[PDB]
Enzyme design. Structure first.
Site, mmCIF file in Angstrom:
data_model
loop_
_atom_site.group_PDB
_atom_site.id
_atom_site.type_symbol
_atom_site.label_atom_id
_atom_site.label_comp_id
_atom_site.label_asym_id
_atom_site.label_seq_id
_atom_site.Cartn_x
_atom_site.Cartn_y
_atom_site.Cartn_z
ATOM 1 N N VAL A 109 12.109 1.800 2.693
ATOM 2 C CA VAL A 109 13.516 1.956 2.324
ATOM 3 C C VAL A 109 13.936 0.632 0.927
ATOM 4 O O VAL A 109 14.666 0.931 0.498
ATOM 5 C CB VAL A 109 14.374 1.050 3.781
ATOM 6 N N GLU A 110 12.612 -0.002 0.755
ATOM 7 C CA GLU A 110 12.579 -0.425 -0.987
ATOM 8 C C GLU A 110 12.349 0.477 -1.653
ATOM 9 O O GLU A 110 13.145 0.034 -2.355
ATOM 10 C CB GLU A 110 11.739 -1.913 -0.296
ATOM 11 N N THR A 111 11.034 1.339 -1.506
ATOM 12 C CA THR A 111 10.762 1.952 -2.101
ATOM 13 C C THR A 111 10.411 3.148 -1.995
ATOM 14 O O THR A 111 9.391 3.772 -3.108
ATOM 15 C CB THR A 111 9.713 1.291 -3.111
ATOM 16 N N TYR A 292 21.440 -2.290 6.170
ATOM 17 C CA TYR A 292 20.024 -2.167 6.036
ATOM 18 C C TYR A 292 19.144 -2.620 6.730
ATOM 19 O O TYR A 292 18.211 -1.693 7.607
ATOM 20 C CB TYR A 292 20.221 -3.903 4.912
#
Ligand code: NA
Length: 309
Positions: A109-111, A292
């Site tokens: 999800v982050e990168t 999220y």
């Protein structure tokens, strides 16, 4: 050499009182050299975009958010990452009690597993938010201080590191304060590199344990029924008894859990209610958002399944 008489730096922060006080703090508190620091900061840029971005039913809201992350391409890349770093992932499970699907979900999800780590120089983002943003200047000044200390210790050139518009770095998008409080040398090379996938894996695991992740505990359990009368969100808290009185029943046994948050997902055709357990709240400690946390969790589950076949 000395240059004691070169007391005024140029650049975007040239006549900024905040930048001056900051240099004083670094010199005074950490033994930084005023002239060396002025040379670095004279190169820092005041980014308007960073300032603009920081200034920030049922209609299928969750479905739209979810499809931003859970796609064939992402799940497939997630499988590749998991397999590539399986030893590190298993080692983090054994050491920290945080399962591979959660770490894989967070980094995905982050990168997108190192594919999108940010294009903004950390120094610019942090200087901009520290010296030209009163609302969060104290927080960001703290991040800039830690960032300059991190660069000094990991022997990085502060101007070479890139990341988010808020100064987040590497695979897990760690803020400088998270690097300080939670990052670990998981690769065993004596260093803590947020851009090394093994260090990032260990660091995300440590962050989770530090924030209360309970090994083996359930994250959330979907509920049968509707509870439109009760306020919902990851910050809510109800006893199982109140939730039952509201018309809900858990699809899976809740073990010894006596309270839960009431989560509500907009699935287009209606609303899907869930009993949020402590581990779900722990995921929100990474990013304060119900969507999220649910995306991180379900992406990890999706990847875990795709690995099976
Ligand atoms: Na390391």
């Amino acid at each position: 050499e000395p240059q004691h008489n070169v007391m005024q730096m140029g650049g975007d922060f040239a006549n900024n009182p905040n930048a001056q006080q900051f240099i004083d703090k670094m010199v005074n508190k950490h033994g930084f050299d005023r002239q060396q620091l002025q040379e670095i900061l004279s190169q820092a840029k005041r980014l308007d975009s960073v300032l603009r971005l920081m200034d920030n039913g049922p209609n299928g809201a969750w479905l739209r958010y979810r499809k931003k992350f859970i796609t064939p391409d992402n799940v497939q890349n997630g499988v590749v990452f998991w397999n590539q770093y399986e030893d590190a992932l298993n080692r983090a499970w054994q050491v920290y009690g945080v399962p591979p699907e959660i770490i894989v979900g967070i980094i995905g999800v982050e990168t997108r597993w190192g594919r999108v780590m940010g294009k903004t120089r950390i120094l610019d983002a942090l200087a901009t938010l520290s010296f030209n943003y009163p609302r969060r200047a104290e927080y960001f000044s703290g991040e800039l201080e830690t960032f300059l200390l991190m660069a000094r210790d990991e022997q990085d050139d502060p101007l070479n590191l890139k990341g988010s518009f808020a100064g987040a770095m590497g695979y897990g998008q760690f803020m400088p304060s998270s690097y300080k409080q939670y990052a670990v040398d998981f690769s065993g090379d004596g260093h803590i590199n947020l851009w090394d996938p093994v260090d990032a894996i260990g660091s995300v695991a440590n962050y989770f344990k530090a924030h209360g992740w309970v090994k083996g505990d359930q994250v959330a359990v979907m509920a049968n029924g509707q509870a439109p009368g009760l306020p919902n969100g990851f910050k809510t808290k109800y006893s199982i008894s109140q939730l039952a009185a509201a018309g809900l029943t858990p699809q899976q046994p809740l073990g010894n859990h006596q309270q839960a948050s009431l989560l509500r997902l907009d699935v287009g055709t209606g609303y899907q209610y869930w009993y949020g357990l402590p581990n779900f709240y722990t995921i929100t400690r990474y990013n304060h958002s119900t969507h999220y946390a649910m995306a991180v969790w379900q992406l990890g589950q999706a990847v875990a399944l795709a690995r099976v076949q």
